[PDB]
RNA sequence: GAGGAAACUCAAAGAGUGCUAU
RNA sequence: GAGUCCCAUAACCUUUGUACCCCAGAGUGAGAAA
RNA sequence: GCGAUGAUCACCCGGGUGGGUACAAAUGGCAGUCUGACAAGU
C-alpha cells in the first residue's frame, strides 16, 4: 500500500534537519545584512521568523513610528524597537536594497511556513506507519529512530538492550573497550515520558520505555492485519506512566 | 573538566619542559605550574600567508 | 581639497630630487609604486615621493593611506618625468621611497628634507 | 559671580541656576575638589531650571555641528532667551566653549559669557552625575545617545556615502553560492522523491531545473493526454524528444504510485526549489549592477563575479587597493581566478586588476573609461604571447 | 611557528581582558569582539566551548605599541572589562579593535583622530564593533567633540605631534575621572630630534606633573620600538603630594 | 590535631556600594 | 544494575575514479627584444 | 615601433614514475550492537 512505506519516513526527517540548518543559516544573513540599516533589533528579538516578520511589516526606521509590530511583538518588545528605530546607528539604505531584503524575509517566513507543513506530514506518515510508536514514544523520536536502523524491520530486529541506547554508540563502544561506564539513554531521551521523570528515575524509564517501544514496534513493523489505531501503543502507554508514578512517588528522604 | 584527558596531560607536559625538544632554542627559565583554567585553542591562517605558514 | 596633497613647491621639491637623485648612486632608493607599497609594511621607509600628474592620480593615492597609518611623512611633486631623471631610470617614476639605513653616508640630508617634509605636512 | 550654566546634552540643551558658588582661592584644594565629585555636596551648588529636547535625530547634528563651530542655533537662542532675565549690569552665564562666548554675546548683549576654570569645574561636575542631576526628567539615556549622534557627525565631514559601500557586494557573493548548494541540494531531492513514482523520467530531464518544473505539471505519470503532450512538448523543446518518451514511458514504468500527501509535498517543495532559483537569478543581476556601480574597472576588466570574489577574499575595496601586485595575484591564486606563458599573462592581467581597484576605490563616483583600455592593454599583451 | 592548524593553549592574563596562547610558542591574545575576521589580517584562535566556537585574535606587539608594553611587563593597565576608555590617535583598527576587546561588550572606546582617509577605515571597524564610537575630529580642540563625550576612566594616547601634553591636558580634564588612568606613548623623533630621547622622556614627564598627572610608571618599548616609552599616571586633581 | 557536608539557623566583625541623606 | 546529551543522520584512515597543479613570499627588482 | 603606470626569474627511460589541491563512490578498516530476576511495601 502506498500510505505504509518507510523509506519516506527516512527521506522527511533528513530533509527536515536539512531545513533546519538552512534555514537557521539565512536567518543570521538578514540578521547582519539589516543589521546594516538596523543593528539593534537582534538583540531585541532573537526569533529568526519574528525578526523576519518585522522587516516585512516595516522597512525602514522612519515607518517604526507609525508602523504597528502587536501582532509580532508583545507591548514590550514593540516598544522598544520603536525607541531603537528612531535612536539607531544605522544607515539609511536604498529601496532597491530593501527590496532584495524584503524578499530575503519573504524567503524566511515561506521555509518556516513549509518547515511545519513538512512536520504535520511526517506526523501524519508516521501515524499510518507506526501509530503504536507515535502513541508511546512520539513522533520526533520514532522516526529519528527507524531512520537510524535504516528501515522499520531492522529497528524491529532490534532488541530493547539495543533501541534504549540506539543513538549512542560512541560512548557506549569507547566505554565498553577503556572498561568504563556505558550509557542508559540513547536517542529516546528526547521522548516526553523519559522528560518528565526526575534524578535516576530519568535511567529507570528509559530501560522501561525501550522494552514497550519493541512491542510497540513489533507489532507495528509486522502485523499483518494492523488497524491504524495505536492501540497496542496507547495501553502499552498506559502502562509505562503506571510505572513512572509510582516510580516517582517514592521518596528517599526520610519524612 | 577533573577527567584531564591524557592527550591534555602529556601536552602540558610536552610545553612544561619545552627547552629539551630542540637543541637550538634555548628559552628563559621560568617553573611553569599548571593553571587552574586552561583551554585548548586552534591558530588558524588567513588567505594571503597560504604559502608561508600553513 | 586636490587629491594629490601636500604638494611642494617649487624650492622644496629642488632638496627632494637632490637626496633622491644621490640615493640612487648609494642603492638606498625603492623606485615605483609597487616598491613604494613594498617599503610601508616593512616599515623600512624614510618618506616617500609622489608624482601630481600621475596618469590617473588615484593610481597612487593608496600611498597615502598606507604612509600616514605607520606614521611615514609623505608628499607630492609636479612632475613624473623629472623624478626619473632623478631617479635614473630611463621612464618615469610617479612614487618612491627612500629605505631606511642608519649607516647611510646621507643621513643628515635625508633628516634635513625629512624635516622640512613634516612642517609641509 | 555665576549665576547661570549652560550645558549641552545629546538629547538636548540643559540650563541650571548656580545657587552657591565655590570658593575661588582655594579652587584647587583638594576639598572643594572632592565635592565636584560628591552629588551631595554638588547638589547645592546647582539646579536644574531647564531642559529642552531635540525634537529628533537630524536637529541633534545641526545643532552638533554649530556647537562644534561656537554657533548659536535657533534652538540654542529659544532656551536661552526663555530662561536668561533681561539685564546696567549683565546676567553671567557659564559655557564650556569660548568660541561660543562671541555668538552668545552677540544674540544676547545683556549676558556675559563664562569660561574661566572655576566655569569649567562646574561643567566638570554637571557632566559627572549627568541624568542623576536631571531629577527624573526624560533625558532618555545620555550614553546611546552619545554613540547614534557621534556616529552621525563622524561621517559627516568625511562625507562616506552609501556609494563607496561595497559589502553589498561581499555579501551577496556568499549569498550566490549559498543558494547555489541549496537548489542543487534540495532540487536533487526532488528527484529521489519522484524518482520513485517515476524513475525514469528523472534520466530523461538531466537538468535538474528542467526537472522541478515537469514535476510540477506531471504530477502523476497516469494522467497522459495529446493536449498534455503538447503542453509538456511546449516546456523546454521537442528536438530532445523527451515529450514523446514521457508518454511512452510513463504508460510502461515500474515506478510505485506514491499517496496524494506525498505529491503534495513533491510540488511544494519542487515550488520551494524554483523560487531559490528565481531569487538566485534575481541576486545574480543585482551583483551585476551593484558592481558596475561600485567598481566599474573591474567589472570591465574581468568581469563582475570575478571582480567580487577578489574582493570577498581581500575583505574590502579598499583591503585590495591597499594590497600589491603580488599579493594580488596569490589571493586570486587558490580558485584560478586570473587564470610558463600561462603564467606571464596571470602576472600581467593581475597588476591591471590591482590598478583597476585603486581606481574604483578613492574615486567617489568611478567611471569604467580606464577599464576599458587597461583590459585592451591586456588584449595586446594576450596576442604578442 | 604560530601556524594555522597548530593548536595552543589559551590562559588568562594578569590584567583582566587579555590571554597568552601558549605551545611551541606564545602569543598575547585577546577575545574578539567580531567572531569571524581579522581587522589587519592578524592571527586568530578559535576555540570549541560549551558547542559555540568562541574565537580570540593574536595581538603583535610590532604592530601596537599598548601590545609591547604588555610585554615590557607594565603593572597597571587601566584598560579593564567594563571601563570607559579615550583613545586618542584612532588612525585604524589595528591597536583600537584589540583595545575593544579588552573593554568587552559592557566597556566603550571613544577612537579620536583627524585625517578622513583612516578614518574611513575607522568608521569600518567601529560599525562591526558596537561598543566603538569613531570621532574623526582635532584632539588639539575638545571643546569641539565635548558634545559627544562623557566621562571616559583611561584615556590613551598614540597622537604623534611636538605638542601632546597640552592635548592629554585638555581631554583629561574635560572627560577624565578624578584618580583616572593615562596612558601616554612617546616618541623621541617627533617632539624633539635635536636632543637625546631620553632627555625629551623627562621633560614630558614634567609636562604630566604640572597639568596635575602623578606619572606612575614608564616603560622603554624596545626590542619592539626604538626611542618610545608607555606612560602610565594617575589623574589626581586634589593633589600630586 | 587536621578536615568535610547541610541553612528562609544563630551570632561577631571588615570592605565596598546604592538609593533627595536637602 | 548501567556517561543519551563529542551529530554511526557522523568523524578519521585506505582503495578507486574525475578535474586541475609541480614559481619565489614579508617574493626579486632592470632588463627585454635584436 | 618595449619597460619602474614594472622587464627578468622532483625522478627515470617523445614516453613512464614521485608528489600536491578539490569533489564523488566503496556491502573497504577502525567496528564489536548494554545486563538479565528480582524490585517495592507492612
Same mark, same amino acid.
Given at each position: 500500500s502506498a500510505d505504509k512505506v518507510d523509506v519516506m519516513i527516512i527521506q522527511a526527517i533528513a530533509l527536515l534537519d536539512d531545513l533546519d540548518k538552512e534555514l537557521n543559516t539565512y536567518a543570521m544573513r538578514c540578521k547582519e545584512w539589516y543589521g546594516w540599516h538596523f543593528p539593534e533589533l537582534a538583540k531585541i528579538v532573537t526569533d529568526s521568523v519574528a525578526y523576519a516578520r518585522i522587516i516585512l511589516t516595516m522597512g525602514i526606521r522612519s515607518k517604526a513610528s507609525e508602523t504597528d509590530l502587536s501582532e509580532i511583538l508583545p507591548e514590550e518588545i514593540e516598544e522598544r524597537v520603536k525607541t531603537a528605530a528612531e535612536v539607531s546607528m544605522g544607515t539609511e539604505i536604498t529601496q532597491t536594497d530593501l527590496d532584495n531584503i524584503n524578499a530575503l524575509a519573504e524567503q524566511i517566513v515561506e521555509f518556516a511556513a513549509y518547515r511545519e507543513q513538512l512536520s504535520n506530514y511526517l506526523s501524519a506518515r508516521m501515524k499510518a506507519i507506526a501509530p503504536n510508536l507515535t502513541q508511546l514514544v512520539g513522533e520526533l523520536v520514532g522516526a529519528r529512530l527507524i531512520a537510524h536502523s535504516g528501515s522499520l524491520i531492522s529497528l524491529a530486529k532490534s532488541p530493547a538492550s539495543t533501541i534504549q541506547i540506539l543513538g549512542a554508540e560512541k560512548a557506549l563502544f569507547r566505554a565498553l573497550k577503556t572498561k568504563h561506564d556505558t550509557p542508559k539513554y540513547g536517542l529516546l531521551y528526547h521522548a516526553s515520558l523519559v522528560g518528565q521523570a526526575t534524578g535516576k528515575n530519568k535511567g529507570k524509564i528509559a530501560r522501561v520505555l525501550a522494552a514497550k517501544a519493541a512491542v510497540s514496534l513489533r507489532y507495528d513493523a509486522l502485523a499483518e492485519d494492523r488497524d491504524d489505531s495505536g492501540d497496542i501503543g496507547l495501553e502499552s502507554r498506559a502502562k509505562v506512566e503506571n510505572r513512572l508514578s509510582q516510580l516517582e512517588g517514592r521518596d528517599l528522604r526520610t519524612t | 573538566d577533573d577527567n584531564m584527558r591524557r592527550e591534555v596531560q602529556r601536552d602540558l607536559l610536552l610545553i612544561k619542559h619545552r627547552a629539551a625538544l630542540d637543541p637550538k632554542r634555548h628559552y628563559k627559565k621560568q617553573r611553569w605550574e599548571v593553571p587552574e583554567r586552561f583551554a585548548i585553542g586552534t591558530i588558524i591562517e588567513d588567505k594571503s600567508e597560504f604559502y608561508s605558514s600553513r | 581639497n586636490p587629491k594629490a596633497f601636500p604638494l611642494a613647491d617649487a624650492a622644496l621639491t629642488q632638496q627632494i630630487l637632490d637626496v633622491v637623485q644621490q640615493a640612487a648612486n648609494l642603492r638606498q632608493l625603492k623606485k615605483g609604486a609597487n616598491e613604494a607599497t613594498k617599503t610601508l609594511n616593512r616599515g623600512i621607509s624614510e618618506f616617500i615621493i609622489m608624482a601630481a600628474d600621475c596618469e590617473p592620480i588615484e593610481i597612487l593615492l593608496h600611498l597615502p593611506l598606507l604612509c600616514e597609518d605607520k606614521n611615514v611623512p609623505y608628499v607630492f611633486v609636479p612632475s613624473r618625468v623629472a623624478l626619473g631623471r632623478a631617479c635614473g631610470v630611463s621612464r618615469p617614476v610617479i612614487a618612491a621611497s627612500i629605505t631606511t639605513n642608519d649607516a647611510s653616508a646621507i643621513k643628515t640630508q635625508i633628516y634635513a628634507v625629512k624635516d622640512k617634509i613634516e612642517t609641509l605636512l | 559671580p555665576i549665576e547661570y550654566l549652560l550645558f549641552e546634552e545629546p538629547t538636548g540643551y540643559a540650563v541650571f541656576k548656580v545657587k552657591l558658588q565655590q570658593d575661588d582661592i582655594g579652587s584647587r584644594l583638594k576639598e572643594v575638589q572632592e565635592q565636584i565629585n560628591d552629588f551631595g555636596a554638588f547638589t547645592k551648588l546647582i539646579e536644574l531650571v531647564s531642559f529642552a529636547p531635540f525634537k529628533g535625530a537630524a536637529e541633534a547634528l545641526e545643532n552638533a555641528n554649530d556647537i562644534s563651530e561656537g554657533l548659536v542655533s535657533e534652538s540654542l537662542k529659544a532656551i536661552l532667551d526663555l530662561n536668561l532675565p533681561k539685564a546696567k549690569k549683565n546676567i553671567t552665564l557659564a559655557i564650556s566653549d569660548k568660541n561660543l562666548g562671541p555668538s552668545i554675546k552677540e544674540e544676547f548683549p545683556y549676558v556675559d559669557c563664562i569660561s574661566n576654570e572655576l566655569a569649567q569645574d562646574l561643567i566638570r561636575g554637571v557632566r559627572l552625575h549627568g541624568e542623576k542631576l536631571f531629577k527624573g526628567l526624560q533625558s532618555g539615556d545620555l550614553e546611546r545617545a552619545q554613540l547614534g549622534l557621534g556616529h552621525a557627525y563622524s561621517r559627516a565631514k568625511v562625507k562616506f556615502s552609501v556609494q563607496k559601500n561595497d559589502n553589498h557586494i561581499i555579501q551577496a557573493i556568499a549569498l550566490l553560492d549559498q543558494l547555489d548548494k541549496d537548489i542543487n541540494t534540495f532540487a536533487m531531492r526532488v528527484k529521489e522523491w519522484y524518482g520513485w513514482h517515476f524513475p525514469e523520467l528523472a534520466k530523461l530531464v538531466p537538468d535538474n531545473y528542467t526537472f522541478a518544473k515537469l514535476v510540477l505539471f506531471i504530477k502523476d505519470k497516469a494522467s497522459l493526454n495529446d493536449d498534455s503532450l503538447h503542453d509538456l512538448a511546449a516546456l523546454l523543446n521537442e528536438d530532445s524528444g523527451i515529450a514523446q518518451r514521457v508518454i511512452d514511458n510513463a504508460r510502461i514504468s515500474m515506478g510505485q504510485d506514491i499517496s496524494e500527501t506525498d505529491m503534495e509535498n513533491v510540488c511544494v517543495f519542487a515550488q520551494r526549489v524554483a523560487s531559490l532559483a528565481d531569487y538566485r537569478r534575481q541576486l545574480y543581476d543585482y551583483l551585476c549592477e551593484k558592481m558596475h556601480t561600485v567598481a566599474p574597472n573591474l567589472s570591465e576588466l574581468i568581469g563582475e563575479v570575478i571582480g567580487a570574489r577578489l574582493i570577498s577574499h581581500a575583505g574590502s575595496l579598499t583591503n585590495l587597493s591597499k594590497q600589491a601586485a603580488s599579493t594580488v595575484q596569490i589571493l586570486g591564486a587558490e580558485k584560478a581566478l586570473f587564470r610558463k606563458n600561462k603564467g606571464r599573462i596571470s602576472r600581467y592581467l593581475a597588476n591591471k586588476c590591482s590598478m583597476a581597484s585603486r581606481i574604483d576605490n578613492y574615486s567617489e563616483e568611478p567611471s569604467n573609461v580606464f577599464g576599458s583600455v587597461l583590459k585592451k592593454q591586456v588584449e595586446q599583451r594576450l596576442e604578442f604571447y | 611557528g604560530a601556524r594555522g592548524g597548530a593548536k595552543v593553549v589559551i590562559e588568562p592574563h594578569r590584567h583582566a581582558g587579555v590571554y597568552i596562547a601558549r605551545g611551541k610558542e606564545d602569543l598575547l591574545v585577546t577575545k574578539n569582539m567580531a567572531p569571524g575576521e581579522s581587522v589587519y589580517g592578524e592571527k586568530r584562535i578559535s576555540v570549541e566551548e560549551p558547542p559555540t566556537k568562541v574565537e580570540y585574535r593574536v595581538w603583535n606587539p610590532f604592530r601596537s605599541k599598548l601590545a609591547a608594553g604588555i610585554m615590557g611587563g607594565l603593572d597597571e593597565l587601566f584598560i579593564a572589562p567594563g571601563k570607559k576608555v579615550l583613545y586618542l590617535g !584612532? !588612525? &585604524?583598527?589595528? &591597536?583600537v579593535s584589540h583595545v575593544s576587546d579588552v573593554v568587552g561588550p559592557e566597556g566603550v572606546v571613544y577612537a579620536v583622530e583627524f585625517s578622513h582617509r583612516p578614518g574611513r577605515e575607522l568608521i569600518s571597524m567601529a560599525k562591526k564593533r558596537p561598543n566603538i564610537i569613531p570621532i574623526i575630529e582635532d584632539a588639539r580642540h575638545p571643546q569641539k567633540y565635548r558634545m559627544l563625550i562623557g566621562m571616559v576612566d583611561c584615556v590613551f594616547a598614540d597622537v604623534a605631534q611636538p605638542d601632546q601634553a597640552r592635548i592629554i591636558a585638555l581631554n583629561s580634564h574635560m572627560f577624565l575621572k578624578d584618580q583616572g588612568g593615562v596612558v601616554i606613548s612617546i616618541k623621541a623623533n617627533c617632539i624633539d630630534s635635536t636632543v637625546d630621547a631620553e632627555t625629551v622622556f623627562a621633560r614630558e614627564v614634567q609636562k604630566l606633573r604640572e597639568e596635575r598627572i602623578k606619572p606612575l610608571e614608564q616603560l622603554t618599548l624596545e626590542p619592539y620600538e626604538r626611542d618610545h616609552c608607555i606612560v602610565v599616571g594617575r589623574y589626581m586633581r586634589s593633589g600630586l603630594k
Open positions: - | - | - | - | !584612532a !588612525a &585604524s583598527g589595528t &591597536s
